[PDB]
Write a protein that binds this ligand. Structure first.
Ligand SMILES: [Mg+2]
Length: 224
């Protein structure tokens, strides 16, 4: 059973290949998760050079199996129930008045390591918009990820709106539509409606010259 794999600290690897308006890039991340505390600590590096989009726009794409599900809600934790075989996570991320990302990720164990492998495609971004113009602040607001069951796909859907702070005081909305489906043929937990309360802090490694992001995140299930 999947939740048993998450009682301790688990190493995490994240590998993303991206193309946004023909700008090709890759990101590699390493860190660890401790679902007992809903806690993630990761460092991401752009391995191809400078990142052509703002780091905050990639946070939702770059492992909700590390959410803390309170004991009384453990029957609603799809994400761990799909492990170790894993799940596919697909998102459409619609940036208001701008372009969109489409992502497809596979999240699964490789040995004792939780791996998130992602392909991201971004299209129809404005050259001097907040994304390609790098007008987003290097910070991150707290959000609720609203989860519903998708019985016919044996999985879940999520809907939420990320509020990215713009450097002039305004907000760039990024609407998210998410679908997750198990990779394996074993049974999974199909949840009642609930949400994940997520808090994220972005920072820099003072000794790192590559383009990078240090992320500390807490994710807690609620709403039941
Ligand atoms: Mg077109």
């Amino acid at each position: 059973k999947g939740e048993e794999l998450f009682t301790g600290v688990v190493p995490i690897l994240v590998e993303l290949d991206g193309d946004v308006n023909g700008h090709k890039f890759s990101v590699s991340g390493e860190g660890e998760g401790d679902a007992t505390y809903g806690k993630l600590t990761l460092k991401f590096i752009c391995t191809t050079g400078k990142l052509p989009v703002p780091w905050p726009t990639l946070v939702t794409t770059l492992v909700q199996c590390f959410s803390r599900y309170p004991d009384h809600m453990k029957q609603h934790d799809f994400f761990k129930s799909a492990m170790p075989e894993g799940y596919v996570q697909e998102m459409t991320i619609s940036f208001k008045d701008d372009g969109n990302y489409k992502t497809r990720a596979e999240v699964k164990f490789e040995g004792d390591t939780l791996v998130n492998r992602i392909e991201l495609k971004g299209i129809d971004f404005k050259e001097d918009g907040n994304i390609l113009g790098h007008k987003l602040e290097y910070n991150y607001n707290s959000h609720n990820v609203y989860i519903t069951a998708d019985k016919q796909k044996n999985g879940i859907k999520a809907n939420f709106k990320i509020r990215h702070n713009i450097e002039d005081g305004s907000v760039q909305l990024a609407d998210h539509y998410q679908q997750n489906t198990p990779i394996g043929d074993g049974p999974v937990l199909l949840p009642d409606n609930h949400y994940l309360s997520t808090q994220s802090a972005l920072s820099k490694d003072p000794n790192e010259k590559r383009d990078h992001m240090v992320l500390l995140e807490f994710v807690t299930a609620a709403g039941i």
